[PDB]
Paper text:
Host cell entry of [name]-1 is accomplished by the envelope glycoprotein ([name]) spike. The gp120 segment binds the primary receptor [name], triggering conformational changes leading to the binding of co-receptor CCR5/CXCR4 that causes global rearrangements in the trimer structure leading to viral and cell membrane fusion and gp120 shedding. In the pre-fusion, closed state, typical of [name] trimers, the gp120 domains surround a bundle of three gp41 helices, protecting conserved fusion elements of the trimer. In this study we combined structural and mechanistic information to construct a mutant [name] that is no longer responsive to triggering by the [name] receptor.
Since the [name] mutations were primarily in the layer 1 and 2 regions and were predicted to block the transition after [name]-induced destabilization of V1/V2 and V3, we combined [name] and Vt8 ([name]/Vt8) in order to minimize V3 exposure. The Vt8 mutations consisted of the V1/V2 mutation Q203M, V3 mutations N300L, N302L, and T320M, and the outer-domain mutation Q422M. The [name] [name]/Vt8 [name] construct displayed a ~4-fold enhanced [name] affinity compared to [name] [name] with a KD of 15.6 nM ± 0.4 nM primarily as a result of an enhanced association rate (N = 2 with standard error). Importantly, the combined [name]/Vt8 construct eliminated [name]-induced exposure of both epitopes. To understand the structural basis for the observed lack of [name]-induced conformational rearrangements, we determined structures of the [name] [name] trimer in complex with VRC01 and the [name]/Vt8 [name] trimer in complex with [name] and 10-1074 via single particle cryo-electron microscopy (cryo-EM). Fitting of atomic coordinates into each map revealed similar overall structures for both [name] [name] and [name]/Vt8 SOSIPs with a root mean square deviation of 0.70 Å for gp140 alignment. However, map densities in the C-terminal portion of HR-1 in both [name] and [name]/Vt8 trimers displayed a helical extension of the buried three helix bundle toward the trimer apex, a feature that resembles the extension observed in open and partially open [name] structures. As a result of this gp41 restructuring, residue K567 displaced W571 from the layer-1/layer-2 pocket that was formed by residues F43, C54, W69, T71, A73, C74, D107, L111, and T217. In the [name]/Vt8 structure, this restructuring was associated with a rearrangement in layer-1 that reoriented residues H66 and H72 resulting in the formation of a potentially water mediated histidine triad configuration with gp41 HR1 H565. Interestingly, unlike previous stabilization strategies that either reduce or prevent [name] binding, the [name]/Vt8 trimer retained interaction with [name] while still preventing [name]-induced exposure of open state epitopes.
Numbering used by the authors:
A (entry chain R): 110 to 213
B (entry chain A): 142, 149 to 188, 191 to 309, 312 to 323, 323A, 324 to 398, 405 to 406, 412 to 453
C (entry chain O): 1 to 52, 52A, 53 to 76, 76A, 76B, 76C, 76D, 76E, ...
D (entry chain D): 1 to 82, 82A, 82B, 82C, 83 to 100, 100A, 100B, 100C, ...
E (entry chain E): 5 to 7, 11 to 66, 66A, 66B, 66C, 67 to 95, 95A, 95B, ...
Amino acid sequence: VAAPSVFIFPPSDEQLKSGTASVVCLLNNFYPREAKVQWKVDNALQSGNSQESVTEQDSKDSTYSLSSTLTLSKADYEKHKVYACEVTHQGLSSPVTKSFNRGE
Amino acid sequence: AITDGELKNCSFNMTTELRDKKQKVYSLFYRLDVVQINNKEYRLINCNTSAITMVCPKLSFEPIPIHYCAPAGFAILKCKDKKFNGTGPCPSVSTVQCTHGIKPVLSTQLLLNGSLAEEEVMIRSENITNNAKNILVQFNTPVQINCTRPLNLTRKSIRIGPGQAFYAMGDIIGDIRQAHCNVSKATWNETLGKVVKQLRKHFGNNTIIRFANSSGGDLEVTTHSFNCGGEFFYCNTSGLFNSTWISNSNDSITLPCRIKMIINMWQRIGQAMYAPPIQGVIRCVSNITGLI
Amino acid sequence: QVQLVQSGAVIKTPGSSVKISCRASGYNFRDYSIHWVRLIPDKGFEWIGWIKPLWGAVSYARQLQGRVSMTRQLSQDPDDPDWGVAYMEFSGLTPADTAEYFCVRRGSCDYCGDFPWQYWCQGTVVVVSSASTKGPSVFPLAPSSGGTAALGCLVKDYFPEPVTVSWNSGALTSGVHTFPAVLQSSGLYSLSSVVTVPSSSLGTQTYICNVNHKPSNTKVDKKVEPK
Amino acid sequence: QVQLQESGPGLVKPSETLSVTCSVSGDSMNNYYWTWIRQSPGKGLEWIGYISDRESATYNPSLNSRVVISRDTSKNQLSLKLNSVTPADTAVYYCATARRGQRIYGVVSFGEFFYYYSMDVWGKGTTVTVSSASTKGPSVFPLAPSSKTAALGCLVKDYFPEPVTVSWNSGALTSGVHTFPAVLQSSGLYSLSSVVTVPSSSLGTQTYICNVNHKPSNTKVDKRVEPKSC
Amino acid sequence: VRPLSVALGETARISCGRQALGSRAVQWYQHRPGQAPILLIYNNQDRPSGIPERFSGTPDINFGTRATLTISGVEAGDEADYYCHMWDSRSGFSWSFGGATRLTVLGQPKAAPSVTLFPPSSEELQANKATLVCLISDFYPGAVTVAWKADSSPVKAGVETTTPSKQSNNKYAASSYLSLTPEQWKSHRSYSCQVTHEGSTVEKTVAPTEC
Ligand SMILES: *[C@@H]1O[C@H](CO)[C@@H](O[C@@H]2O[C@H](CO)[C@@H](O[C@@H]3O[C@H](CO[C@H]4O[C@H](CO[C@H]5O[C@H](CO)[C@@H](O)[C@H](O)[C@@H]5O)[C@@H](O)[C@H](O)[C@@H]4O)[C@@H](O)[C@H](O[C@H]4O[C@H](CO)[C@@H](O)[C@H](O)[C@@H]4O[C@H]4O[C@H](CO)[C@@H](O)[C@H](O)[C@@H]4O[C@H]4O[C@H](CO)[C@@H](O)[C@H](O)[C@@H]4O)[C@@H]3O)[C@H](O)[C@H]2NC(C)=O)[C@H](O)[C@H]1NC(C)=O
Ligand SMILES: *[C@@H]1O[C@H](CO)[C@@H](O[C@@H]2O[C@H](CO)[C@@H](O[C@@H]3O[C@H](CO)[C@@H](O)[C@H](O[C@H]4O[C@H](CO)[C@@H](O)[C@H](O)[C@@H]4O)[C@@H]3O)[C@H](O)[C@H]2NC(C)=O)[C@H](O)[C@H]1NC(C)=O
Ligand SMILES: *[C@@H]1O[C@H](CO)[C@@H](O[C@@H]2O[C@H](CO)[C@@H](O[C@@H]3O[C@H](CO)[C@@H](O)[C@H](O)[C@@H]3O)[C@H](O)[C@H]2NC(C)=O)[C@H](O)[C@H]1NC(C)=O
Ligand SMILES: *[C@@H]1O[C@H](CO)[C@@H](O[C@@H]2O[C@H](CO)[C@@H](O)[C@H](O)[C@H]2NC(C)=O)[C@H](O)[C@H]1NC(C)=O
Ligand SMILES: *[C@@H]1O[C@H](CO)[C@@H](O[C@@H]2O[C@H](CO)[C@@H](O)[C@H](O)[C@H]2NC(C)=O)[C@H](O)[C@H]1NC(C)=O
Ligand SMILES: *[C@@H]1O[C@H](CO)[C@@H](O[C@@H]2O[C@H](CO)[C@@H](O)[C@H](O)[C@H]2NC(C)=O)[C@H](O)[C@H]1NC(C)=O
Ligand SMILES: *[C@@H]1O[C@H](CO)[C@@H](O[C@@H]2O[C@H](CO)[C@@H](O)[C@H](O)[C@H]2NC(C)=O)[C@H](O)[C@H]1NC(C)=O
Ligand SMILES: *[C@@H]1O[C@H](CO)[C@@H](O[C@@H]2O[C@H](CO)[C@@H](O)[C@H](O)[C@H]2NC(C)=O)[C@H](O)[C@H]1NC(C)=O
Ligand SMILES: *[C@@H]1O[C@H](CO)[C@@H](O[C@@H]2O[C@H](CO)[C@@H](O)[C@H](O)[C@H]2NC(C)=O)[C@H](O)[C@H]1NC(C)=O
Ligand SMILES: *[C@@H]1O[C@H](CO)[C@@H](O[C@@H]2O[C@H](CO)[C@@H](O)[C@H](O)[C@H]2NC(C)=O)[C@H](O)[C@H]1NC(C)=O
Ligand SMILES: *[C@@H]1O[C@H](CO)[C@@H](O[C@@H]2O[C@H](CO)[C@@H](O)[C@H](O)[C@H]2NC(C)=O)[C@H](O)[C@H]1NC(C)=O
Ligand SMILES: *[C@@H]1O[C@H](CO)[C@@H](O)[C@H](O)[C@H]1NC(C)=O
Ligand SMILES: *[C@@H]1O[C@H](CO)[C@@H](O)[C@H](O)[C@H]1NC(C)=O
Ligand SMILES: *[C@@H]1O[C@H](CO)[C@@H](O)[C@H](O)[C@H]1NC(C)=O
Ligand SMILES: *[C@@H]1O[C@H](CO)[C@@H](O)[C@H](O)[C@H]1NC(C)=O
């Protein structure tokens, strides 16, 4: 077993100037492939606006990555403040979150 | 621009599907297979007497070992004496069901892919002092050869009748080059060091032994004939048989070589064959085991 | 050698119809049956049909009635019997017909059946998508300022695939991750591509994401730096 | 290593033996094969013919037999002589040398190769035209400076056969010296105008003579620029 | 003969146009207008001294791939004609060049004009001629107009130019001679030199008492 180094990539103005921005949770260098990666918008559970992809087991490290997205409209991101993800594994004894409050 | 030509580019009429309509077709015939009538107008070498039968394309002529076997009530006896010059008693005899597999190869002046001797070179003739008898030579070690046709060719598909086509030479995709064969020089000069050595036990020690080249004839007997790869090579061997003997690395001998595709084997009256062209360049490797 | 050359890669719109050819050689083409199978990306294999040469007798699946049709082309040469060409027309395309089609022959046998499949063609992908050809843009990814951190870019809303993305043109290869193409957001794909570097070099170097969408001749280069 | 200068009269009359002589230094001319190429204006380039070291004479089968090359080894002077010249022989003449190569593609001593050449020294070119006109001496007037750097100039009016060479300080001034095309007169003549940048703190000091050369009319000119209050 | 056009820095590709047969030995030249040709590629692959390393032929080709010239990055002084000289084995002795392509580069700066002014030279005002001369340069592009008004009135008589043409510094030029006389000077108070580029006009004025 191993532990992925959790990130949170903030919603840039580079995509919100087009009207749909990308809040990107990003896990790297873990095994097993299964994971329960959740997310929250202003501390509230959303759905139906995500496309999550896994990768394959590498030939050198034999590990995995994961990248989820949370694509909303431009009215919806500036409406809220507290953006955070949730990470949960067999190999973690505690739920890990990281944050990026919007505007702060 | 003529340096020394080989191919000729021709033109003629040929029937289409419907046998009342005529069209212009061309081909690329060698100059040995084309003779002159009188811009200019030519024709094939044997429209007088012979019916040139095109060898089927589904055929394949190739050396494959034939074992000669005797039916019941008969047996074949094999000598195993290693000094057997060809006549008289053989003190070591063993009955065999079927002989070893000889590979039928039809060549002249040199014996290709043959069977080797055992200890030394074996010189072998009938009435040695008689001139008209040939002298069979057999080697104990093979002498390798490398042969090629270094120009690339394709095939046309000029039809003749319903279901029966005809193949001809179409294009020279590349560059015009002469077909040739290599014999190594240091192996050939040592293989003649043995044939001279045991000729002198039949004639005399203090004699001078020389090799000349030829004195005339057709291409079948002045040169070295093959049958390799589907084509018929006639190589000029005046560079091998040229040396004297006086009783005391990598440089190969090149042999220039001609090609013709209308052959008449055994010279039967009014009969001739035809070899269809091979698509692509040709490569051959062979051993020389013996002389005549 | 028993060769089975299948062609070729097709992109079509829904409602259309595709014809896929399958050239065979190295055996007598008038003797052996030729199966057609389809490999769904999330349902597994599916047997389309079955053609027998020398007369052209065919049979299909029963869920693919009224749409598929297949025939052949017999070589007529008395001096070359060993080649032949098969065909297949698969009409009534919808986006759920996108998969990879195969043209599968059996092997020589004494005690077995017809369906054991020995010689396999390379396959071809038939894409059915109403999206039109569109270039990718590029959008940078970085932290604001010890421990390693993800630089990267986002290559969003292109059609069709594949995008080949290199880094600093192109020697920065270690620590480089790519994701498979994110699925259709209104018919368009995206690619995530992130590179892990220690966080000291973020404030030192300028990093480049080299998008190369070849079917549209689009090429973009975003600089990635801690903003 | 090898230095090549072209010489030749600017105007010759039609139906006359042309002569272009190639000044050669270095004396390494007997390691090379010599040739001439030409560009009739408005076309690409075309060769003329080969002279060897053993003097094997070949020429292009796109001209007639009216071409002859001679080569001297004593004065080291090549010669080109187009006989029975016409206005079709209006071109620019480059003298050139070439080495030999051979691209072997098979067995050597069966003759399976060919030769290929390439050119290594480029000359300076001589321009020759053909007409029944005669050579006209110029009318040269040096142009005075202005008060700014400063604008030194010269005029060569009434000259044909063209081009014109204009230099300065008896050839010794090469900094800031440039000429433009001599503008075509309607009278069939040409008027060169020169432009030379000199500082004004120096231009009113040294002996600025408009230096011209003219080989086809056989005249040399040296006239002094005079100062003026522009 | 044949144009070609890439941007400054963009990789130029020049196919020859000689359907070569057999074995070949291609040569490429730089014929830069105003000078003599320059042997770029020798025997398919050799770049002699005096040729920059940004030019390279095709050394790695087997039998049947078309020879093409690859210029990596183009500098301003690289507009020239690029002849492909191609000898073969299935042809005679080859005396035809075959073209060629002119790499005319785009994205070149910039039109920044000037006029150089020249007097009525007092040595031939006594011979009843005027040496009013403008000498114009420093362009890109170089298709430029020169003009000469009689204080508001356009004159065209006595004026002779050429076409525009390049300098050595990769910018264009335009020059002009005027056959005015001291009868044609003193009729008007002044003449004025006019140069236009792309709609913009340079105005310079002269006089017999202010040159
Ligand atoms: C019977 O025996 C006979 C004799 O024993 C055999 O006859 C021989 O037949 C072959 C053909 O099958 C002939 O080969 C040809 O010879 C050319 C002449 O060679 C000159 O240059 C030699 C350079 O030596 C180097 O290279 C060779 C091979 O590359 C190598 O063996 C040697 O050790 C050394 O590394 C020099 O040694 C010779 O003495 C000659 O001076 C030879 O150049 C030909 O090769 C050409 O052409 C072919 C086809 O065009 C190309 O594929 C080759 O790559 C090569 O072309 C290269 O050079 C050209 C410039 O001339 C370029 O245009 C090409 O692009 C290419 O350039 C690349 O490769 C070069 C090699 O590194 C580099 O320098 C370049 O920069 C590029 O990378 C051709 O092979 C023999 O000459 C001939 N021998 C005799 C004595 O006549 C006969 O075959 C035998 N028959 C049988 C059936 O066995
Ligand atoms: C003396 O003995 C030697 C040793 O056997 C013999 O050399 C053999 O020659 C045959 C010529 O048929 C070679 O067979 C060919 O080998 C090549 C190698 O790549 C194959 O490509 C060939 O396959 C083709 O065969 C037909 C030709 O048209 C086609 O119908 C077919 O589809 C293939 O295209 C073919 O197998 C054989 O390999 C060599 N042997 C060795 C060990 O190399 C030589 O011929 C003998 N001397 C004489 C004069 O016969
Ligand atoms: C091939 O080998 C055989 C046997 O090894 C050779 O046969 C031998 O030939 C010689 C010829 O002179 C015979 O010698 C003669 O014998 C008779 C009596 O038979 C005698 O009258 C003569 O004076 C002379 O001695 C010899 O007998 C014979 N060998 C045997 C075993 O009979 C044959 O010559 C060899 N072939 C060649 C071409 O050398
Ligand atoms: C085609 O090649 C042949 C073979 O060289 C040329 O044949 C010549 O024919 C004339 C006719 O009498 C002979 O005198 C010559 O001796 C032959 N050989 C040579 C080398 O000239 C023939 O000339 C060629 N075809 C044409 C149209 O020239
Ligand atoms: C042999 O001759 C034929 C014609 O007699 C040549 O075929 C011609 O090739 C040219 C190529 O420049 C084509 O434009 C013509 O249309 C061809 N003619 C026909 C009837 O097809 C052929 O190239 C010659 N072969 C060789 C090796 O020289
Ligand atoms: C068919 O045979 C005739 C007769 O030999 C050949 O014509 C030539 O005839 C004269 C007189 O009869 C002989 O002196 C010549 O030697 C003959 N020429 C040749 C080449 O043999 C005719 O050429 C022959 N045709 C064919 C296709 O071989
Ligand atoms: C002889 O010529 C044939 C063409 O007639 C050559 O075959 C080609 O080879 C190239 C290189 O592998 C392929 O790209 C082509 O597809 C081939 N053409 C065909 C029709 O198959 C062949 O390589 C040549 N042989 C030699 C020794 O040069
Ligand atoms: C005939 O051709 C064969 C290749 O088919 C040659 O064998 C090669 O010889 C060289 C030089 O000794 C070796 O480096 C190679 O390893 C040999 N090839 C193999 C497969 O062993 C042979 O030398 C040629 N013979 C002659 C007389 O030229
Ligand atoms: C080898 O045989 C050739 C012919 O098979 C002989 O060649 C002749 O040589 C003489 C010189 O003595 C020439 O005048 C003839 O023209 C040649 N004949 C041909 C057909 O060209 C040669 O003499 C023989 N011997 C040697 C040592 O080469
Ligand atoms: C077989 O090859 C020999 C040479 O290896 C040929 O002899 C040459 O014949 C020509 C014809 O006059 C001469 O020009 C050459 O000088 C000869 N070569 C030598 C080395 O003397 C011989 O002619 C060839 N055989 C045939 C039938 O042509
Ligand atoms: C042609 O000669 C070669 C050389 O003898 C044969 O190849 C083998 O060569 C090795 C040498 O390392 C010998 O030990 C073998 O006995 C040879 N024969 C075999 C069958 O391996 C080659 O076989 C000869 N060609 C034919 C048709 O017999
Ligand atoms: C072969 O070798 C012998 C002995 O070394 C030598 O006398 C002879 O000149 C060589 N060459 C030929 C062609 O016999
Ligand atoms: C010839 O040489 C052989 C070699 O051993 C010898 O036995 C024989 O007696 C010799 N003959 C003569 C006549 O010298
Ligand atoms: C025949 O022998 C002589 C004398 O050794 C030699 O010069 C000549 O080249 C030989 N002939 C051939 C065709 O090699
Ligand atoms: C068909 O039944 C026979 C009965 O012996 C059996 O041997 C064979 O394996 C069966 N075929 C298949 C394809 O299962």
